Design a protein around this nucleic acid. Structure first.
Ligand SMILES: [Mg+2]
Ligand SMILES: [Mg+2]
Ligand SMILES: [Mg+2]
Ligand SMILES: [Mg+2]
Ligand SMILES: [Mg+2]
Ligand SMILES: [Mg+2]
Ligand SMILES: [Mg+2]
Ligand SMILES: [Mg+2]
Ligand SMILES: [Mg+2]
Ligand SMILES: [Mg+2]
Ligand SMILES: [Mg+2]
Ligand SMILES: [Mg+2]
Ligand SMILES: [Mg+2]
Ligand SMILES: [Mg+2]
Ligand SMILES: [Mg+2]
Ligand SMILES: [Mg+2]
Ligand SMILES: [Mg+2]
Ligand SMILES: [Mg+2]
Ligand SMILES: [Mg+2]
Ligand SMILES: [Mg+2]
Ligand SMILES: [Mg+2]
Ligand SMILES: [Mg+2]
Ligand SMILES: [Mg+2]
Ligand SMILES: [Mg+2]
Ligand SMILES: [Mg+2]
Ligand SMILES: [Mg+2]
Ligand SMILES: [Mg+2]
Ligand SMILES: [Mg+2]
Ligand SMILES: [Mg+2]
Ligand SMILES: [Mg+2]
Ligand SMILES: [Mg+2]
Ligand SMILES: [Mg+2]
Ligand code: NA
Length: 414
RNA sequence: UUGCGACGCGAAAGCUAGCCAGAUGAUUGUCCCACUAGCCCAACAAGCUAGAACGGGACCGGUUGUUCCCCCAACCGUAGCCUAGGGAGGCAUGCGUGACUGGUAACGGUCAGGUGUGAAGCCCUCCCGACAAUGUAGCCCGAACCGCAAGGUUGAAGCUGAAUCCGUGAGGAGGAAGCAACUUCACCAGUGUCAGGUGAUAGGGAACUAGGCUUGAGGGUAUGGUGAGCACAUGCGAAGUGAUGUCAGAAGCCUCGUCACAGACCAACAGGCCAAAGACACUGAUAGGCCUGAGCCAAAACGGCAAAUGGAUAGGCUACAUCGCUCGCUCGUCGGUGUACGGGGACGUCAAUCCAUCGGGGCACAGUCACCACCUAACCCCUCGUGUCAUCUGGUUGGAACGCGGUAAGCCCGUAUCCUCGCCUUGAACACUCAAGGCAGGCAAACCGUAAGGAAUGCUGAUGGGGGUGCGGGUAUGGGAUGCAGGAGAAAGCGAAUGCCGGUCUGUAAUGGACCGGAUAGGGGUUGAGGAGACAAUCCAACAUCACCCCGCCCGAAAGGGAGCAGACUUCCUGCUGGUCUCUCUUUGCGAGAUAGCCUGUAGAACCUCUUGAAUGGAGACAAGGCAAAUGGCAGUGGAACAAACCACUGGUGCGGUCACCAACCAAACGGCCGUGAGGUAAAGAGGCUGCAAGUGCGUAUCGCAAAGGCGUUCGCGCCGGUUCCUCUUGAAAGAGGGGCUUUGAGAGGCCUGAGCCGGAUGUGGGGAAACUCACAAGUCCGGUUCUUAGGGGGCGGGGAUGGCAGUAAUGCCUCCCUGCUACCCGGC
DNA sequence: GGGTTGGCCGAGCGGA
């Protein structure tokens, strides 16, 4: 099946996008209508449901037996006409960073319809979106937001004034009428969705279809900031909801404040007064964990000290849990944490920050090894827990050698 | 489950505490006199010894008084003893292992030799003994060239040290002879050589570690301690007061300075220098090398200035306190602080050395800070006194984990005695009949299991098994954690108590203490303990908690076993019990909250059927920000040369809108209007049936959480919390604000293990001068307390599952569950 | 503005 079921869907996605590169929204709505009423679209929809850890919804359906795939997909073969979405189930997943962050879970049939119209929406939200919008799109990392911050703010390639903005309104605070007016999908399905209390009201508009909506609602910013015409003055860089704007002066960024607040005025959104601030590089703004400053005609994207303190909080808590552990288990928990904070900051100025990070986790590991055996000397723990692994002594681990990854040895790529 | 630890006793023996009294040694540099000793052997004295004998004078050495010098002052002394520490024996004991032996068995006794332990409650003698082990973060060494390996030559931090010389002497000056680790790297302004130097390191060394007592008593005095442990919203508790803090973390500490680890380093880059920078050559004039810097001056190149903001200082094997990035307590070296530390002189002081306030990181076995009450007196001050310290001896009161004692109910074994006793299948004969065999059961264990124990095999299989009782032999063994009550048995104690039971007074939070009263044992005979008696002649006496025989009574049939109050400790049996936690359902709070159905309108061009009627059926091009009830698992073109597989490219599927059709049906023009064809043909309405829209179902099925109250009360409420939901904020388990509530039951099921702490009575050791602290199973014992829900594995007995193997079958056997026991092992304290 | 390696004082009694 799936050796062609992805293929026909993706070809028809290509045809939707080729429709939107000319006007032809009749062609677009025809191919959306057709792809939604395709067997392959429905089969893909139930695969995307079954591969996201389905659990108890209100309208409980199963996942298993490899026939309820065919049962449910023939069920939504009919189901466009009498489709009534049932409301959500208020499910708390206990995040390991502070709460049980709530996440309203739809019905499996409702999330299958969401996956259907998600593969309908995607090739329109590719082409009609921005070109400096990096949130939640295809093929785009948050590192590319830093790359756009680089080739915007480089060797005097801006003029030193940047607006650090952010958008209020927690939920999909968008006026429902605006969504129903201009979104390239069938207004009856979206009409039934927005009535239903669509996503549970602790949602932060960054459940598959809601990023497609929250990208489509924020795609006029780049065009309406080509109302200003200078050389490299206005550049907008936006990751999913958190954007910063460039400029050349304090009052022209206030033109940009009034412009963007008129833009979001039509929708249900307002920029804040707190989180919005104008700032002069070099005084720095925080953007996706990376501090951007200048430090005297350098650029120096550095990972900010609120993305370092969060990483030390993660390792501090990983060892406050493993307080009586085995040494190889301590390597096993602490090693992908450091590798994930390595591959994420490996394109920026981070090597100095990596040596300070390995320093601080080393002191945590030393306090680990010394709190292990209280009344026992120090040369014992140094040669029992730490290995001369090379030129380096003090390399934590045991055993072919099992040992932590020094984040400082992770080879920053230009 | 920790080497032992329970309980009574100290009859006796040996450790041990308090007190009393004696004896002995000692009371710690040298000399001179003072006093006394062997002192006139002439009481003169010149001369001999010892001196807490507690005197004075003059001197030696050491340490402190901040490096060196010269004074001065205080303190210490080469003596005796004790301990830590080391060595060597015996001795005792724990666990094994073989050899022998008792006994019917259960179970023992004895030697050997293998390994432990001998102690903070628990071995004896001897020797070395304040010298040493032992340790170390700072300091010092850790070379210098001959050269075959490093062999030697020398050096060498340093150790030890004679000869000599001075002084009455303590001592002072020299250091011959001897001993001694020295191993491996890196940097020097390119490379190589040679010279001249610096920094890690194996080890070595210095330094300390390396003790204590030898003058007491009172009074004042704290820099020295204590005032529980826990939780915290409230508190429990006999056990200060009040703040403040709990993981987005107080106090303390390690770092570091706004880009906030090594006041880092190397590379890059930028600015400057230099002529290969100690020489001798090679190479390079510019990247050739070096300096400085994510700040600045520099420049022959000596290096300096500020380093977030202020601020301080000279010289420490000094003493005390703290700290060196977090368990408590005692220590060793080294380093930083803070307080205290005579007179003069010389040398000369400051380096990013240190402190303080902010600020960035961190570190977390939860305390901290202030006050109050009380304790102790080292030091100092004051008063009084002449001793003090160690050991041994004797007395006396005590104690114990050391020494002694107790078999009895439990269990095992033997003995006599009463009761019970199979099961199958076949040949069954006279019908119970009986056989033959296997089972079930009784005994050995080869072998396995560290271990609980099990099992091959063999042995027996009513000639034998099992249960009950009465005896006899053996062995029961030692932990506070949930009490209590009853029974079996009950050591020591008492023929009148140390116990018991009443009574009186009194103390603690609780255990307690003193005193008065009361009960409490069949007989005889015997040995004849032991005292009597002028005596050994009397030659006794019955109790010596009763040594041994018969009757009174019980029990048993017998042998006999028993029988007065308490009756400790360990056991065994029976009953009633406690606490807390996990899971499931229930009920209530907060939030969410539907589909099917029922109903009222709406739409159906893209859903059907039917009735209809200018009112039908099948198909093309063009478009398409209008819509939809099968749909793109569709079709076409091309690549394969069209062909077989696969791959590129195109497609709006339908309704609607416009041109444009094909089938099927005709208004008008037309000879009495019989006939004709050029020409015209797109609705409405009823049934279901799907959707929509509201309502009812319904605050319901169901889902996510949660069940926590206290205090003031002025009775209205308020504050502190808890719980659910919403909103702001934060990277974040933090916070801010708001709404509600402030709240029930049952079910089975775990589990009894530990941490301590306080008081009292006793012991021991480290620290301390002492209070007091840290430990000895919470020291132990009793008493009072909170807290932890209290760990895995394995085995044996019973009832089932009970699928198979073996099976004529009895049934066992590998596999599951329920249930009883188990210290049987590895934790753990 | 990338590239390397540091950190370790010992004894003893008793515990979370
Ligand atoms: Mg005695
Ligand atoms: Mg004497
Ligand atoms: Mg002197
Ligand atoms: Mg002086
Ligand atoms: Mg010996
Ligand atoms: Mg001495
Ligand atoms: Mg050296
Ligand atoms: Mg050498
Ligand atoms: Mg050394
Ligand atoms: Mg000495
Ligand atoms: Mg005081
Ligand atoms: Mg500083
Ligand atoms: Mg800086
Ligand atoms: Mg500097
Ligand atoms: Mg000194
Ligand atoms: Mg006093
Ligand atoms: Mg006693
Ligand atoms: Mg005892
Ligand atoms: Mg006991
Ligand atoms: Mg025991
Ligand atoms: Mg008790
Ligand atoms: Mg009893
Ligand atoms: Mg007795
Ligand atoms: Mg009496
Ligand atoms: Mg009484
Ligand atoms: Mg009761
Ligand atoms: Mg009940
Ligand atoms: Mg005591
Ligand atoms: Mg002990
Ligand atoms: Mg006690
Ligand atoms: Mg313990
Ligand atoms: Mg203990
Ligand atoms: Na426990």
């Amino acid at each position: 099946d799936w050796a062609k079921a992805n293929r026909e869907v993706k070809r028809l996605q290509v045809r939707i996008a080729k429709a939107v590169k000319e006007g032809r929204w009749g062609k677009v709505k025809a191919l959306q209508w057709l792809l939604t009423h395709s067997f392959y679209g429905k089969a893909l929809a139930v695969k995307r449901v079954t591969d996201n850890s389905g659990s108890k919804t209100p309208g409980v359906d199963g996942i298993t037996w490899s026939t309820q795939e065919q049962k449910a997909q023939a069920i939504k073969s009919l189901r466009r006409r009498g489709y009534k979405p049932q409301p959500l189930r208020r499910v708390y997943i206990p995040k390991a960073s502070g709460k049980q962050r709530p996440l309203g879970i739809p019905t499996t049939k409702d999330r299958a319809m969401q996956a259907l119209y998600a593969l309908a929406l995607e090739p329109v939200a590719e082409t009609t979106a921005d070109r400096n919008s990096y949130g939640f799109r295809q093929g785009r990392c948050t590192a590319d937001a830093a790359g756009q911050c680089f080739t915007v703010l480089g060797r005097s390639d801006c003029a030193k004034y940047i607006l650090d903005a952010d958008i209020t309104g927690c939920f999909d605070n968008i006026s429902h009428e605006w969504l129903l007016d201009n979104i390239p999908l069938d207004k009856e399905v979206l009409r039934k969705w927005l009535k239903s209390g669509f996503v549970w009201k602790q949602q932060l508009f960054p459940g598959v279809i809601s990023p497609m909506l929250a990208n489509m609602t924020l795609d006029g910013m780049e065009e309406l900031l080509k109302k200003h015409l200078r050389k490299q003055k206005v550049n907008l860089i936006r990751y999913a909801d958190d954007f910063v704007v460039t400029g050349e002066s304090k009052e022209t960024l206030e033109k940009v404040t009034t412009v963007i607040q008129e833009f979001l005025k039509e929708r249900g959104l307002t920029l804040s007064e707190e989180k919005t601030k104008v700032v002069h590089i070099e005084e720095g703004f925080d953007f996706l964990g990376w501090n951007i400053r200048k430090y005297g005609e350098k650029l120096l994207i550095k990972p900010a000290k609120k993305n370092i303190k969060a990483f030390h909080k993660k390792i501090r808590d990983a060892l406050k849990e493993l307080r009586t552990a085995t040494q190889e288990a301590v390597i096993d928990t602490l090693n992908p944490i450091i590798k994930g904070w390595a591959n994420y900051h490996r394109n920026q100025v981070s090597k100095r920050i990596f040596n300070r990070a390995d320093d601080n986790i080393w002191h945590k590991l030393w306090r680990w090894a010394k709190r292990r055996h209280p009344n026992k000397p120090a040369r014992w723990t140094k040669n029992k827990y730490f290995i001369k692994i090379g030129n380096r002594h003090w390399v934590f681990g045991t055993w072919r050698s099992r040992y932590l990854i020094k984040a400082g040895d992770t080879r920053i790529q230009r």
